[PDB]
Amino acid sequence: HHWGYGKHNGPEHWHKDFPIAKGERQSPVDIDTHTAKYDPSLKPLSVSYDQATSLRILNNGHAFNVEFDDSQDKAVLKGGPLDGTYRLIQFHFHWGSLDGQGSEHTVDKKKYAAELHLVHWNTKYGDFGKAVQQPDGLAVLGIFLKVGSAKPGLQKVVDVLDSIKTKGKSADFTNFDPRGLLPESLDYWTYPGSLTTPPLLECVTWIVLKEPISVSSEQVLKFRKLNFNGEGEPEELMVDNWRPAQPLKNRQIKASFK
């Protein structure tokens, strides 16, 4: 009865083991674009990924994580709503069984086919584990995916998925450049929220880019061939691994653009 995304163990059940699921700053949320407010106080977003060192890709039973060396400032996020420097630790995606769903955040109730999360921790707390004990511990850059033309910079990810089909499998994944997953514009919305998987901790400054990236149908179809289950167990496709929008609870979403 471990948490997951099935009928028996999915988001509507998480509150039993993780009561913060009903907390005051849970994620994701619907971004109501007209009630967001442009904030001219928002310092410029600096995404500095030139020196990133990817290491490994892991099927963790709920998504796949591309992991980075976070022992030095090598891939960092600064500016915008953030104070100081946040280091990239991993990215992963959420996606649907169908192109019409899969994102966690929505925009005026519109669901995208998938959503990329680049997860960063605030260097003032020393490592990720200490950072998730803090209200300003994490910054997540969220990027929507729509189905259209292929994203060349995603193909190395797509191709390695065959080697991490099942829960617990990992593979070397060096020399991957996350700059190839960014849209042209860094216009964004920001609000305070939480992890979107258990333990659902309320540590996150969310930075959700307005411009989606386009990926091809063939690319997202490969995501949908992954398995939630381990090797040798009956196949349960890793699809619909998204938490739906949660109550905003009077939080204000800020826009970086007028």
Distances (CA, A) of 60 to 63, 83, 164, 186: 6, 31, 9, 29
For Hg ion, give the closer residue by CB, 122 or 194.
194
By CB atoms closer than 10 A (0-12, 13-18, 19+), residue 126 is exposed
Sketch the per residue contact string, 89 through 128, with Zn ion: x for CB under 5 A, - otherwise. Answer: ----------------------------x-----------
- 191/86 Cα distance (integer angstroms): 16
Out of 62, 105, 117, 222, name the contact with Hg ion by CB under 5 A.
Answer: 62
Out of 10, 23, 61, 153, name the contact with Hg ion by CB under 5 A.
Answer: 61
Binding residues: 92, 94, 117, 196-197
Selecting among 15, 62, 105, 120, the annotated active-site residue is 62
For 102, the token pair is: 């899969």
CB of 44 to Zn ion, least distance (A): 25
CB of 193 to Hg ion, least distance (A): 20
- 65/56 Cα distance (integer angstroms): 8
CB of 167 to Hg ion, least distance (A): 7
For residue 170, the cross-strand partners are 58
**Is 78 a residue that touches Zn ion (CB under 5 A)?**
no
CB of 177 to Zn ion, least distance (A): 20
Residue 105 annotated to the active site:
no
Dihedral sign for Cα 34, 36, 41, 44, please: negative
For Zn ion, give the closer residue by CB, 117 or 151.
117
**153 is in the binding site of which of Zn ion, Hg ion, none (Cβ under 5 to 8 A by kind)?**
none
Name, in order, each residue with C-beta under 8 angstroms of 103's C-beta and a sequence gap of 6 or more: 28, 94, 111, 112, 113, 114, 115, 144, 145, 242
Binding residues for Zn(2+): 92, 94, 117
- 169/163 Cα distance (integer angstroms): 8
- Active-site positions read 62
Contacts with Zn ion, residue ranges (CB under 5 A): 117
Binding site for Hg ion (CB under 5 A): 60-62
